[PDB]
From Swiss-Prot:
Pfam families: DHFR_1. Its EC number is 1.5.1.3. The lineage of its organism: Bacteria, Pseudomonadati, Pseudomonadota, Gammaproteobacteria, Enterobacterales. It catalyses: (6S)-5,6,7,8-tetrahydrofolate + NADP(+) = 7,8-dihydrofolate + NADPH + H(+). GO terms for biological process: 10-formyltetrahydrofolate biosynthetic process; dihydrofolate metabolic process; folic acid biosynthetic process; folic acid metabolic process; one-carbon metabolic process; response to antibiotic; response to methotrexate; response to xenobiotic stimulus. NCBIfam families: PRK10769.1. Changing residue 85 to A: Decreases catalytic rate by one third. Increases catalytic rate about 7-fold. Pathway: Cofactor biosynthesis; tetrahydrofolate biosynthesis; 5,6,7,8-tetrahydrofolate from 7,8-dihydrofolate: step 1/1. Keywords: Antibiotic resistance, Methotrexate resistance, NADP, One-carbon metabolism, Oxidoreductase, Trimethoprim resistance. This is Dihydrofolate reductase. Substrate binds at residues 5, 27, 52, 57, 113. The strain K12 sequence is shown. Strain B [RT500] is resistant to 500 micrograms per milliliter of trimethoprim. It is an enzyme of class 1 (oxidoreductase). GO terms for cellular component: cytosol.
Length: 159
């Protein structure tokens, strides 16, 4: 099974200038809980944005060019990325925009954080078709002293 996990600001914005400008510790904790002990697939730009391997996960990087770091696994196509995960119950696709576009048609589950924040971005999560997806979990949180925007954790499953 392939799942996508992402955090979306208003208008499906996910990034600006190869960064995420907000800081929501509760959402990073959600990301870690839902990805730990699973393979994670990311594009090269997202690898550069994170800047280090994510511990406790097999890190698989898509790039058309040879890898530059043997602490992670480098692959050159979607099918190779999936194969490199082996026989696991759930593969996590962690972006960015171009990678999400390619994996969306193959995904059964979306883990989405909806952040009540306006930021002028250059990368968006794919337009997906709402009729294709059932919301099976949602949990709303007001802003607090640690998290400066309200946010909603949602899990959707392909109908
Ligand atoms: N809010 C969130 O949830 C979230 C999550 C992830 C990322 N982000 C943000 O998203 C942005 C990065 O997204 P992006 O769309 O620019 O880049 P991306 O999807 O991270 O990376 C694209 C790169 O991945 C490689 N690639 C993708 N598909 C491939 C394929 N089929 N075969 C081979 N290589 C392939 C290519 O690398 P080469 O050029 O080396 O061939 C391509 O240039 C940043 O702003 C980041 O902060 C946000
Ligand atoms: N829900 C969600 N939120 C995100 O912010 C997110 N970000 C990315 C891409 N960017 C990043 C940037 C940093 C870390 C990161 O450092 N994660 C640590 C959390 C511990 C911490 O630094 O506070 C991790 O171990 O997973 C992960 C992804 C991909 N999917 C996401 N999915
Ligand atoms: Mn091929
Ligand atoms: Mn197999
Ligand atoms: Mn806000």
């Amino acid at each position: 099974m392939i799942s996508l996990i992402a955090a979306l600001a208003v208008d499906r914005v996910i990034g600006m200038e190869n960064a995420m400008p907000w800081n929501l510790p509760a959402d990073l904790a959600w990301f870690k809980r839902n990805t730990l002990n699973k393979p994670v697939i990311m594009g090269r730009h997202t690898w550069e944005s994170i800047g280090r391997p994510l511990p406790g996960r097999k890190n698989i990087i898509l790039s058309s060019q040879p890898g530059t770091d043997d602490r992670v696994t480098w692959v050159k196509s979607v099918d190779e990325a999936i194969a490199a995960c082996g026989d696991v119950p759930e593969i996590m696709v962690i972006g960015g925009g171009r990678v999400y576009e390619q994996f969306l048609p193959k995904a059964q589950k979306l883990y989405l954080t909806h952040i009540d924040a306006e930021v002028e971005g250059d990368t968006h999560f794919p337009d997906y078709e709402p009729d294709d997806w059932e919301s099976v979990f949602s949990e709303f949180h007001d802003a607090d002293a640690q998290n400066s925007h309200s946010y909603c954790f949602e899990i959707l499953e392909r109908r």
